[PDB]
Design a protein around this ligand. Structure first.
Ligand SMILES: O=c1ccn([C@@H]2O[C@H](COP(=O)(O)OP(=O)(O)OP(=O)(O)O)[C@@H](O)[C@H]2O)c(=O)[nH]1
Ligand SMILES: O=c1ccn([C@@H]2O[C@H](COP(=O)(O)OP(=O)(O)OP(=O)(O)O)[C@@H](O)[C@H]2O)c(=O)[nH]1
Ligand SMILES: O=c1ccn([C@@H]2O[C@H](COP(=O)(O)OP(=O)(O)OP(=O)(O)O)[C@@H](O)[C@H]2O)c(=O)[nH]1
Ligand SMILES: O=c1ccn([C@@H]2O[C@H](COP(=O)(O)OP(=O)(O)OP(=O)(O)O)[C@@H](O)[C@H]2O)c(=O)[nH]1
Ligand SMILES: O=c1ccn([C@@H]2O[C@H](COP(=O)(O)OP(=O)(O)OP(=O)(O)O)[C@@H](O)[C@H]2O)c(=O)[nH]1
Ligand SMILES: O=c1ccn([C@@H]2O[C@H](COP(=O)(O)OP(=O)(O)OP(=O)(O)O)[C@@H](O)[C@H]2O)c(=O)[nH]1
Lengths: 219, 212, 219, 212, 212, 219
């Protein structure tokens, strides 16, 4: 059993306020173990640091495009922290485009990406990566349990949906755990996607076998 | 007086093959418009991009790689406009926004093609309009304007919000999101009205005006 | 027997009017088989699409240099179609310079090039590639049988010359199957070159053993 | 009349978090100064760069990779200034000297961050001042000026040679070497004097003036 | 009034070592010429490039890699001219044509070296003249002009066609092909006439004039 | 015993007047042998050619920065001569940044660097490379025997110090075989450094075992 997996690590999980060192350390260990039997690629988000800086740029009335560029820039500094945690198993530099990630995987090294272009999120970056690498699996480690019928941190009636088809995720994301564009990419290619939180992330070996309490999305 | 971004649909510039005289005309008009305003242009892929994408589809290429092929074709198309724009154009096809910005500083018309998988040239033009803080975004597509359907009806004016509903193709969602998020005044016209850009940018057109 | 081979696939063969899907598919299979025992690199031309677009640029009186750039751009879109046909065996992106092709070969992947610079053709690109990689063989798959004393599609007395030395090819190309610069490169390094048409291209395994009806050029 | 290079310490722009109003002010003043002189700016990393560097340290990352992380953070900081500088700034963060040179030709303020492992933004600003043959180099750090120690004393004026001794941190050695090697007139002031750049560049300041 | 491209032979700029005063002079004249015309320059490799190429030859390096070494040396030589051209030169060595184009827009003299294996700086200058639609191409080589042989004879005027025959070295074939294909007015002079470029570009010279 | 080694080959040794072909040939052989058992990376300096060209730029009163750029440019032409001598064992192009050197080492090829940035020397480039690659050893082959208490080509009392700690080298370089910045890098990471001349360079196998008459610097 040898699969190719893309992990989309949410910026808020990686950097809630300041970088969460314990989680970085722990997820790096997990990723490292999984990389022993599978080809692993990674995309990380911006988190609190990205929101601070973007908010500063907002006070100077900068364009929404320049603000995206700032967030992207912050996601790459974050990606560097994971690369550091992955030690010798990581590709040494933040990967900025898909074919470069492909190369890293050829060299049996783990490529870690940050954002790529204005208009979308690292979620979209992760989906396109998975699509490009023809990954068997896309694992989204976010700050919520899985996919709910409503925002679980707010709406009391929010119920978790264990399994859905890409179309379901599209409805839900429109009515969000995942960004729309990312949702469209997952739906156009039929990328098998798992959405889990920090708890399940503690054991990626089990997660990739389907043993988790998150949400599984597939055609 | 104005900073304008023109989004020329691929099917309009290259219906089957390249529409020679139309390219000559749009190039000429774009030139006149640039004497009075700052011009930037993004060109689509058209039928040619679909042919090449279909070929890759036959080899079960991933959707991401197909996007890259379409992008490559949109740049080939852009080179045709750059050629028609002669000395008033920025020599090479622009691949990123600040590059378009440098061209504007040099008083040269930058012509972009696509940029990244996942979206279309509309998104490119939208993000370009937004990056440059353009006053106007002109979308020249294969449809007469924005209809309430594919017996539909054409909506003269509407707000960014209403544009997001309708798109739920005429314009891709990402592009509609960029337009709403920033409130970019946008005009959607067909090949017919594109035959007189000079007047189109002054309200004289029978297309659709999307504005906050 | 492990050789390093550079294949120069003519644009007119790859795209006679529209892309010739059957030939692309077939040559990709052949290239794939040859790559099992040898290191394969590929360069492709522009064809009909390149002539259309270049001709459009001519109507706008653009420089001959800008027109070359357009042809190059079209050859890269063509190269992408072959990359697609080569599937997992191909280097994912159009290679734009020789050392990048070298890398692809290091990764046991097939690099596919398009044009590189104004002033010459993909033939020259292929010759320089072969020279750079120190290839044992340069195979030119064009739209003619091999090298003739005159244009075979026109002159009735055109006779095919089975074997010649680089000097011969130079005379012939001056008095063309191959572009002059490409001819000069083949002559300065003494690159063993085979010139065949579509028919012989159906079996590259046989072609590289010398079993073909084309022309062989070597010192 | 003058070509000036400003070196803004990371701790000054980002003490803990970004100092909003200070950024607004320095951005405003830099803008006024640019009406009369050619301006170029290099921004440091501050506390944020140290946090991120410390994290990498915890994973025993090499010193070279830590330098790369600090550099990445200095560019994030530079984007904040570029934002505050609005349309008078060069859009992207400048990564090499001739790039800064192009920005100057375009009458836009280039804002650089770090560039290479082994040194700091002071060296970047010094080499930038030198590359551009700038008339003045203004160093805005967290210290009042150049003291004979960390009861030390502040030295009003001194020569490049004497600056090399003192640094044997206020300013990194490589930067001091570049300043001496070329004889770049340099002014070292603190956050206090930075509150009125317009006068600082005219001698009115209580910092240190290093000059041959 | 005119857009001119100068092709300075490597042996002329670097006979054995760099010809200091000659570089100073050609740099000075190029500067004067640029006050009245748009100037672009391409520099060769000379004896130095041959030394380095010969060394690689000793290790049986491929001809392609030798070309890359010669190219690298031609850029080293170009940096010497850029240095002599001072503030009127584009800071970095130009590696591609549109880059030279940007320099021209900035009113700075771009100085290119070689660009691709397979040809020489003559081809680079020819393609540059062609890309820029230059009115004149001035070739400064080690020979007095274009002779009917290596008792030969010098041909005052000739047409592109006749230049292609003669080259079948003074000028490389690719360059001759570019000159003919486009009909670039070309002047071929030696180090002697290069001592007064200002007059050379006005017909006053005893070299050869290749023109359609 | 498999170590990772960075060799800093002084420009004056590689090019004393004109390129020293015999030394290039000989050191390439040595480097090639060492690369059979270890991961080898290389940085080379400018030498006489770099000083000539820099001096020409001085006569035109160019900035010290532009002069550095010229020296860097010359070091890369020099690096190409070594690459040529290393034949098939070398990475085909002059490496310009550390992660690219990392890649070359992944491909079991020898990367050869020239200068990288204004302000320092190839010595600093070598030290940062070693630091980046986490090399076990940095070997400096310069034009002097090892580290002396004074300039050995001038001061009669110059005595060679066989062993010292990074702090020692810092004092000495301040009061130079090695450039200050390079010295600071060696001291901040504690890079084990050996400083030898041409004589000892004739047998790198012995040098890396500690059998040499040069200077060894380590914490
Ligand atoms: O490819 C990319 C990545 C990131 N970004 C920009 O950087 C920011 C961070 O990128 P994230 O991927 O973390 O965005 P998110 O919106 O899902 O972030 P949170 O709300 O959960 O904090 C986003 O706000 C986006 O604008 C891009 O523009 N493009
Ligand atoms: O930024 C871009 C631009 C273009 N493309 C890719 O290139 C192709 C052409 O890009 P277009 O912008 O022309 O697409 P369109 O689908 O809107 O085209 P028509 O249907 O009217 O014919 C599209 O199919 C898209 O996938 C990208 O992936 N990214
Ligand atoms: O490296 C390159 C490749 C291609 N090109 C440019 O692109 C075009 C296509 O490149 P080809 O290699 O297909 O040219 P060809 O001349 O042998 O083409 P046909 O006549 O057989 O159709 C050529 O016309 C050339 O100008 C370059 O300028 N440089
Ligand atoms: O060119 C550069 C710039 C910066 N950096 C790296 O980025 C970091 C921040 O770069 P700074 O220029 O802010 O460093 P500083 O150490 O002088 O910072 P403070 O102590 O006052 O907080 C530094 O730690 C340095 O290693 C480089 O490696 N190279
Ligand atoms: O674009 C270029 C330029 C130069 N070169 C390579 O660099 C070298 C120097 O480039 P030159 O343009 O000086 O060559 P030249 O041969 O005409 O030189 P001389 O004989 O008069 O001494 C040449 O030997 C060539 O191979 C290229 O390969 N491509
Ligand atoms: O990374 C680099 C490398 C080199 N250089 C520049 O190129 C030149 C050659 O680089 P070297 O590394 O050979 O300098 P060196 O000072 O130790 O040279 P010698 O005195 O022994 O001859 C140096 O003078 C330097 O200015 C840089 O600026 N940066």
């Amino acid at each position: 059993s040898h699969m190719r997996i893309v992990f989309d690590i949410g910026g808020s999980v990686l950097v809630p306020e300041n970088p969460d060192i314990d989680f970085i350390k722990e997820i790096a260990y997990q990723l490292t173990k999984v990389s022993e039997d599978h080809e692993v690629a990674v995309v990380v988000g911006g988190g609190k640091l990205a929101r601070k800086y973007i908010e500063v740029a907002e006070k100077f009335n900068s364009s929404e495009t320049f603000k995206d560029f700032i967030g992207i820039q912050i996601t790459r500094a974050n990606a560097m922290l994971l690369i550091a945690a992955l030690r010798e198993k990581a590709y040494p530099v933040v990967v900025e485009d898909f074919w470069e990630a492909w190369k890293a995987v050829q060299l049996k090294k783990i490529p870690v990406m940050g954002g790529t272009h204005p208009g979308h999120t690292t979620d979209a970056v992760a989906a396109l990566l998975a699509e490009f690498l023809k990954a068997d699996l896309l694992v989204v480690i976010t700050n919520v349990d899985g996919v709910y019928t409503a925002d679980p941190k707010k709406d009391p009636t929010a119920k978790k949906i264990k399994k859905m088809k890409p179309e379901e995720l599209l409805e839900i994301v429109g009515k969000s755990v995942i960004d729309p564009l990312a949702a469209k990419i997952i739906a156009r290619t039929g990328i098998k996607t798992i959405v889990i939180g920090k708890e399940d992330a503690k054991d990626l070996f089990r997660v990739i076998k389907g043993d988790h309490n998150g949400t599984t999305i597939e055609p």
